[PDB]
Amino acid sequence: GIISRRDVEYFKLLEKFQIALPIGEEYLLVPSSLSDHRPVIELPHCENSEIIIRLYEMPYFPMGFWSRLINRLLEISPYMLLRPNRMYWRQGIYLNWSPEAYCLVGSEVLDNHPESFLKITVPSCRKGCILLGQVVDHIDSLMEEWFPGLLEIETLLKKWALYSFNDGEEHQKILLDDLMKKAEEGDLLVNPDQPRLTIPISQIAPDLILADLPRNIMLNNDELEFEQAPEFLLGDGSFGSVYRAAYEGEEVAVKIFNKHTSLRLLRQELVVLCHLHHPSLISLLAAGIRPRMLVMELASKGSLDRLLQQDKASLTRTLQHRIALHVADGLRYLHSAMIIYRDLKPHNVLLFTLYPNAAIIAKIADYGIPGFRAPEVARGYNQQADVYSFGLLLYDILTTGGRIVLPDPVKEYGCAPWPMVEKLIKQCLKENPQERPTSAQVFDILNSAELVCLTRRILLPKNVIVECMVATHHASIWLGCGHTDRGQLSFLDLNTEGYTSEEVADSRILCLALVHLESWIVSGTQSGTLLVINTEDGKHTLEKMTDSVTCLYCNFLLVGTADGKLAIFEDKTVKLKGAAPLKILNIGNVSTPLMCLSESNVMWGGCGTKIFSFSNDFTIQKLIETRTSQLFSYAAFSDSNIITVVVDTALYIAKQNSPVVEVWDKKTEKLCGLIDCVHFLREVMSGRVKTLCLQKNTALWIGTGGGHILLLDLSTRRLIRVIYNFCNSVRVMMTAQLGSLKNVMLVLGYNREIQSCLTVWDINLPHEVQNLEKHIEVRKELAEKMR
Ligand SMILES: Cc1ccc(C(=O)Nc2ccc(CN3CCN(C)CC3)c(C(F)(F)F)c2)cc1C#Cc1cnc2[nH]ncc2c1
C-alpha cells in the first residue's frame, strides 16, 4: 500500500480523510490495500520476563480505527522524552529502533473468541515503558475523540495486562482495574496458591505508576510536605482541588485527581504538560500516584482576576504592559505547537511578582475546576478565538474594573488613554476571524516601546497647518498657524481635546513665547509685529521689528529677527503698548536670519552659519563659524543656515536641508563630531533634520523630514532607537508638562489635503526602549534554557 509521493504528485485533504498519511522520505502510507497480513516479524525477545504485553479486547474494530491509529503511532519515539525500522500491515504497525527499544502493535484473534484484540508488545525496559505509555495514550485519546461510546458503560472494551510468574509458562491476564486496585494495595502481584511466586506490579504495567516520566519530573516523596485539608485549599474553592504544600523546600501548588476516573485525566494532563517548556506557562515540577498528584510552581501574588478588583492600585502602566506581553507570549508559544487554549480569562492568568521590571510576571494556567467567548464560540476551538479572548483580556487589563465586576474603554471607565493598546484591542476583537491578527502578530505589536510611551495623539482640523507652538508652564497649547496669509492664533486643550482659533495678525505667526510675571503670549509674525495677547483676558503691540520675527525666547524677552538683529525687552517692558526694547544689536546681516536661541547661565544662539554667545551684558562673546566643517562634512550641508542650536556640554547644530548634525566644543570652538542621520536611517530602511530637542537624562531627540525620530545616547553618540509610523514629516518638537508631574515630549507632525497631528510621548522613551529590549533578551534566554 506504500506509494511514493512522486507517483501521486490537496495532500492536506488526503491526510484529513485518511488517504495519504505521509510516512517519510517522500513516501505515503495509504492504508488501503496494504499487506493485509502479518509479514513475519521476529521480535528481539521471546521470554515472558523480557517483554510487556498489553491487550485490548473489543467487540469489533470500528471503521477507520486502524488507519487513524497507525497515523497516530507513526510519530512515536522513545527519545522524545535513531530511525526506526518501520513495518506496516493493514491492522498493525511495527516499530524497531533497537533490541532495547521497539513496539509491536497489531490485531490479534483468540481461539474460540469472536472478539477482536489489539496487542501491544514492548521490551521490559525504560524505553519500552515510554513506548508503551505513548501507545496507550494515543489509543485512549483516539477512542475518546473519534469513537466515543465504546468507552462508556465498558461497552465490551476490556484492557488486560499479560503476566507470568516463571519464564516458560503461558501468559495469564489481569484487568487493568483489578491491577490498579492491587497497585494501591501493594507493589506485588501474588500467586493465590503459592505466595512464594511474586512479580512486581510495575514492569508488567509500568504506565500505571508513571514509570515513563522524565527523570526530573518523578516525585520525591521524601521532599514533599503535603497535607490534604481545606485549610491549605488555594483560592478558598477556586482552581478546584489545588492545595498549598512544600516541595524541595519551596512552596508549591498541588492538584489532586482523587475521587474520579484518575490516571486517565492525570496521564492526559501529563502528556500535555511534559512537552510544554515555556516561560509564560506554569511549569510542572512533579507528579505522583500514591495520591494522584501534580506538583507545580506556586504563584505568590495569586491570579489576575483577584488583582483587577482587590489591588487596583498596583496596576501601573508598565505592569499592565508586561502582563499583556507575557500572556501574548504564552499564547504565541501555545499556538506555535498547534495547541489551543480554549478559555482564556483573567482567572487563568497567574501573577508571580508585582515588580514591573521583573523578568517573569504573568503565566497562563489551566486548572481543573461565558462573556469571554468569541461570537463563533458562543453561537457554536480556533486560534482566532484565542486572539479574541486575548483582546477581551487586554480590554479588561486596560480598563480599571468594568466587565469583570464593547463600549469605548476611555469614556466609560475614565481609563487614561493608551492609544496603541486600544487599536490592538480593536483589531483583536474583529468579528471576522480572518481579519484578526495572529498570536505572533499580537506579540510583535505588544513588543514595542512606542506602544508603551505613546500617551496622546490629537488630530487637528483638516487643512489647518501649524507653524509654531508653545505650552503653558502648568495641558494647554498655543499654536501659531500659517495655512493662510493672515496669521491665526489657536488654542488646544490637551486634557479635554478641544480646538479654538482666532485671527489676530495680518501676516503669518512665525513664533510664540510666554512672558510670566500675570501671563502674556508674544506672537512674532512675518511683518515683524510683536503682538502681546493676555493669556486670561482676550485680545498690546511692541515696537515693530525691521523684518520678520524668526524666534522668540523667554529674565528677559529675546526677539531674533530675520534681519540678523536681536532685540532685548524687559518683562515689565512688554506689558505696555508700543514699548521699545531694552537693547538692539546686530550679529548677522540682511541675508543671515537669527534663527535660533538656547540657554545653558550663558545664552547661545544660531545666526546664519555662526554660533554666537552672550552673557548678561548682552554683548557677543564667542563667534564660531561652522562653515569650516565642510572639510569633514559635505559642502552643501555645512554652508546652510543654522536652524536650531542645542547645548548641554557641547553645541549640537542642525542646519537647513542638512541631514548631518554637527557637534562643536564650547571651549575650543572646534568640531567635535558629526551625526549622519541618513546612515542611521539606512540601518532600518529622507534624513533631513527639521527639529532637534534635548533630554537632560542622557538622550538626544532628532526629528527628520521623513517623519522619523532618532533617539541617540549622547555617550559615543550611539543610536538608541528610530521611531516612525506616526506621521510623514516632523515639524515641531518640544518638552512640556501635562500636570501631575508628567514630563512629555510634544511632536507636531504632518500626515501629508494636509492632516497635522500632535503626538505626546513619555519622556522616558529611550529608557523604556532599552529596558524592553533587555527584558525581551532575558526572556528569550530563559526560553532557550527551558528548551
Ligand atoms: C496545580 C495546577 C495543575 C495544573 C495546572 C495547569 O494549568 N495545567 C495546564 C494544562 C493544559 C495546558 C494547555 N492546554 C492545552 C489544551 N487545552 C485544551 C487547553 C490548554 C496548560 C497551559 F498552561 F499550557 F496552557 C496548563 C495549573 C495548576 C496550578 C496552580 C496555581 C498556582 N499558584 C497559585 N496561587 N493562587 C492560586 C494558584 C494556582
Author numbering: 1624 to 1632, 1649 to 1720, 1727 to 1798, 1805 to 2020, 2036 to 2046, 2050 to 2074, 2092 to 2160, 2165 to 2207, ...
Q: What does the primary publication say about this deposited structure?
A:
Mutations in leucine-rich repeat kinase 2 (LRRK2) are one of the most common drivers of the familial form of Parkinson’s disease (PD) (1–3) and are also associated with increased risk for the sporadic form of PD. LRRK2 is a large, 2527-residue multidomain protein. We present cryo-EM structures of LRRK2RCKW, WT, and carrying the PD-linked mutations G2019S and I2020T, bound to the LRRK2-specific type I inhibitor MLi-2 or the broad-spectrum type II inhibitor GZD-824.
Although all three structures assumed a DYG “out”, αC “out” conformation with a broken R-spine and a disordered activation loop, the WT cryo-EM map showed a closer distance between K1906 and E1920. In all three cases, the G-loop was folded over the inhibitor to interact with its pyrazolopyridine and Y2018 from the DYG motif. Here, however, the cryo-EM map for LRRK2RCKW(G2019S):GZD-824 could accommodate two rotamers for H1998, while WT showed density for a single rotamer. H1998 is parallel to F1890 in the WT structure, where it adopts the “up” rotamer (H). A potential role for H1998 in the GZD-824–bound structures is in the stabilization of F1890 in the G-loop, which is packed against the pyrazolopyridine ring of the inhibitor. In this case, the cryo-EM map of LRRK2RCKW(G2019S):GZD-824 showed density indicative of two rotamers for H1998, only one of which would contribute to inhibitor binding, while we only saw the latter in the cryo-EM map of the WT complex. The prediction, based on this structural difference, that LRRK2(WT) might bind more tightly than G2019S to GZD-824 was consistent with in vitro measurements of the IC50 values for GZD-824 for these two variants.
